Amino acid sequence: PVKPNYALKFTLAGHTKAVSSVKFSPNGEWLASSSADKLIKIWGAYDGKFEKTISGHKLGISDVAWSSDSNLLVSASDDKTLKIWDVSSGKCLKTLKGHSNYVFCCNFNPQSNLIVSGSFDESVRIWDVKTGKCLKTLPAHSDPVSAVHFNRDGSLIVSSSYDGLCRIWDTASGQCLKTLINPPVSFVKFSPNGKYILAATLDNTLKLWDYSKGKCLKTYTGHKNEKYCIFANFSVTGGKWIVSGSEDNLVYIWNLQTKEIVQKLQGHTDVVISTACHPTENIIASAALENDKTIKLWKS
C-alpha cells in the first residue's frame, strides 16, 4: 500500500485530567489508559466500552505497561512509586518503592518477571515482579529519564533522558553496552526485531537508528514535538508505519522506509501525548492532554 485508511470509530471519555499513556493488551483484548487524575482505566479494544477503573496512587500517573500474559499492569506515578495491579480484581498486588522523585516510565520484560523503570531521579531501576524488591539501580543519566524499554528477548534495556543520550544496558549485569550522543531525547524504544531503535528528540524529529552500527538510518519530520515526551510506535499489523502524537493536535503516520508522511489524523483538541497500535488489528489508540482528556480509537 501507499496510504492507510485510518478513520475514527470511538471517542472514550471518563478521565477528569490529562491522559498520559494508552497501551493495548498483548492479547489484543483491552486498552489501558493512565491519567494525571491518579487513575487507570481499562476499556474494550473493539467497542470502546468502559470496563473498569483502577485507583490507588496518591499522585498522577505517567505510564502504564502490561504483562505479556495480559494479567498484570504496572503503573509509574508522581508519588515516587510504581504499582503492580491484578487487572481482573483491580487490587494492587505490589508497590515498588525506591525512586526518590517522579517515576516517568515503566515496562515489563517479555518474561514479565522483571520491571524496568525510569524516574526524575535520573536513574533506571530493575525490579523483581514476584517480590517487588529492587534488583538493580543503574545510575543511568544526568537528567530526568524519559523512556525505558526491554528488547525482544529481554536481554537488553534501552533508556533515554533529557541529558540528550540514549543508552543500551545489559540486563543481567546492568552494565552500559552502548551510548549514542544534544537536544533532550524524549522517547526511545526497540523495533520489533530488536535490531533498530526509534528515538524522538525535542526538535520535532524522530530517528530510527541501528544501534548495532550506531548509525541513524531514518529521520521522520513534519510533526510538532518540542516540549512533551510523546510516545511513538511501529505499526506492523498492516503496512509498516511509524505513528506518533504531536503538539498540533494531530496523529502523524509516516511510511517507515519512504519516511514520507502518509496520513495526519484529525480530531483531538490538545496535544496528543500517547499513541498505541493494536497487536493484531489495524487499530490505533490516541490520547491527548487536558482541554481534551479523551481517548480516540481509529481503524484502518
Binding site: 490529562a18 505517567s62 533532550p184 512533551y228 501525548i273
Partner: peptide, 10 residues
C-alpha cells in the same frame, strides 16, 4: 509529570 511542561518552563 508527562502531562506537564515543568522542564520546558525553566
Amino acid at each position: 509529570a508527562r502531562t506537564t511542561s515543568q522542564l520546558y518552563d525553566a
